[PDB]
């Protein structure tokens, strides 16, 4: 209830800033397809247990739906619907020929063995084959899913389809040995770095030697901090895990920080540096701020203390709308959540193109194409933000929903 209602409220807020017909808004409120299936597997003890799987294709006007799969024991149908709703305009803003999709299974993979995980993935594919495909619905990695599981899923889809078409293209995020694409690990970070560089160029500020404060030191956060450090010439000054944050004015090299975290389970007490909580970490005076951690991290309470000129929210909605408004009134250029982390879905689209075309690119071509796509999308959103004189999230939403609306009108779905 809560996630889908939040998503539809955000869609209404975005739509009231532009001229969109009521019928189109009502159509976009309801996802096109919802598939709730029972996924049965045989456990290692011999018993047969059935889980509940959801596959929501929110829209496919612009093209085949693209959406991730989450294996976590809490999400429900409404959560998957809201995430597919987000995926729709996340692929729309990047100007991809994709619709919005999402997948999930109510399951806790912590206690599932490797054989059990493989059986669950294969049975999920067997259940949802009738509504997925290379040209209809492309699954993507998400929470608690890895390239191994979706290599298994692609194998099952190939077995069912009898190798009639491009099986490798049914699912993305696959291992490089079987249908994989270069740059998948660094996709989100690369997209975020491209967006930060474009925002800096828009603001006319040089990034040579500037300061970046990154909250959240996961895979995406670490790669963002590193890619900033070398590519942007930026001085990394803040990285935080779930335990605490690390500060040093002179600069941090993410490699040894990651080694320390892997050695002792956390980055706490890094040599030659001070320990600061994430709450005061968001209060640093830097040039770039990157929240790459738990969502709704910047709230209305601490929004007044934010001083970074450019903030790029890698995480999914880590800034509350009120805090977003307070950052807007402070002259702070803020990259939308679904535009900053769109590198992952853009690289997944590139992987799908490689699979369907039968031609595999090098990391150089993938990086160049991701750079071009990010630049074009960001500057389209930036021009919209100046033209309509509304916040950057709303500009990105307007661009994405306008693209989806135009796709619907061209297909004849909506006559208004
Ligand atoms: N075939 C393949 O290519 C393949 C297969 C398997 C794995 N992999 C790779 O192996 C990795 C698996 O690990 P992961 O991606 O799950 O790592 P992660 O989520 O970034 O974090 C590692 C673990 O630490 C916890 N954690 C959460 N937030 C954290 C933070 N800020 N700092 C430190 N720890 C935190 C997480 O559990 P909680 O959040 O619940 O505390 C998680 O289980 C993947 O990134 C994937 O690329 C690849």
UniProtKB/Swiss-Prot annotation:
Active site feature: 102
Transmembrane parts of this sequence: none
SMART domains named in the record: ELFV_dehydrog
Binding site residues for NAD(+): 216-222
Record's keyword terms, sorted: NAD, NADP, Oxidoreductase
Keyword hit for NAD: yes
Catalytic activity line of the entry: L-glutamate + NAD(+) + H2O = 2-oxoglutarate + NH4(+) + NADH + H(+); L-glutamate + NADP(+) + H2O = 2-oxoglutarate + NH4(+) + NADPH + H(+)
Group of enzyme by EC: oxidoreductase
EC number per UniProt: 1.4.1.3
Molecular functions (GO terms): glutamate dehydrogenase (NAD+) activity; glutamate dehydrogenase (NADP+) activity
GO biological process terms, semicolon-separated: glutamate catabolic process
Family, similarity comment: Belongs to the Glu/Leu/Phe/Val dehydrogenases family.
Subunit structure: Homohexamer.
Name used for this protein in its record: Glutamate dehydrogenase
Species assigned in the record: Thermococcus profundus
Lineage summary: Archaea, Methanobacteriati, Methanobacteriota, Thermococci, Thermococcales
Protein encoded by which gene: gdhA
């Amino acid at each position: 209830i809560d996630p889908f209602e939040m998503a539809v409220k955000q869609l209404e807020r975005a739509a009231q800033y532009m001229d969109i017909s009521e019928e189109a808004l009502e159509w976009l409120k309801k996802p096109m397809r919802i598939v709730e299936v029972s996924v049965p597997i045989e456990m290692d003890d011999g018993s047969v247990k059935v889980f509940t799987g959801f596959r929501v294709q929110h829209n496919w006007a612009r093209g085949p739906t693209k959406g991730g799969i989450r294996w976590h024991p809490a999400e429900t149908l409404s959560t998957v619907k809201a995430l597919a709703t987000w995926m729709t305009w996340k692929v729309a803003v990047v100007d991809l020929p994709y619709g919005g999709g999402k997948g999930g299974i109510i399951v806790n993979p912590k206690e599932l063995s490797e054989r059990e995980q493989e059986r669950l993935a294969r049975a999920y594919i067997r259940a949802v084959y009738d509504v997925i495909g290379p040209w209809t619905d492309i699954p993507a990695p998400d929470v608690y899913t890895n390239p191994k599981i979706m290599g298994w899923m692609m194998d099952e889809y190939e077995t069912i389809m009898r190798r009639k078409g491009p099986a490798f293209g049914v699912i993305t995020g696959k291992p490089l040995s079987i249908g994989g694409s270069l740059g998948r690990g660094t996709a989100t970070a690369q997209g975020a770095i491209f967006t930060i560089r474009e925002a800096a160029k828009a603001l006319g500020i040089d990034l040579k030697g500037k300061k970046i404060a990154v909250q959240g030191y996961g895979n995406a956060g670490y790669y963002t901090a590193k890619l900033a450090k070398e590519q942007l010439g930026m001085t990394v000054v803040a990285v935080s895990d779930s335990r605490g944050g690390i500060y040093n004015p002179d600069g941090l090299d993410p490699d040894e920080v990651l080694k320390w975290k892997r050695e002792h389970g956390s980055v706490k007490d890094f040599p030659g540096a001070t320990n600061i909580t994430n709450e005061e970490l968001l209060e640093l005076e830097v040039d770039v701020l990157a929240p790459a951690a738990i969502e709704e991290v910047i709230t209305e309470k601490n929004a007044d203390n934010i001083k970074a000129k450019i903030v790029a929210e890698v995480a999914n909605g880590p800034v509350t709308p009120e805090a977003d408004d307070i950052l807007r009134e402070k002259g702070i250029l803020q990259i939308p959540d679904f535009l900053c982390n769109a590198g992952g879905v853009t690289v997944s689209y590139f992987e799908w193109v490689q699979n369907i075309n039968g031609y595999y690119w090098t990391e150089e071509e993938v990086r160049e194409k991701l750079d071009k796509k990010m630049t074009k999308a960001f500057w389209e959103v930036y021009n919209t933000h100046k033209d309509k004189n509304i916040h950057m999230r709303d500009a990105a939403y307007v661009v994405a929903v306008s693209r989806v609306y135009q796709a619907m009108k061209d297909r004849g779905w909506v006559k208004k």
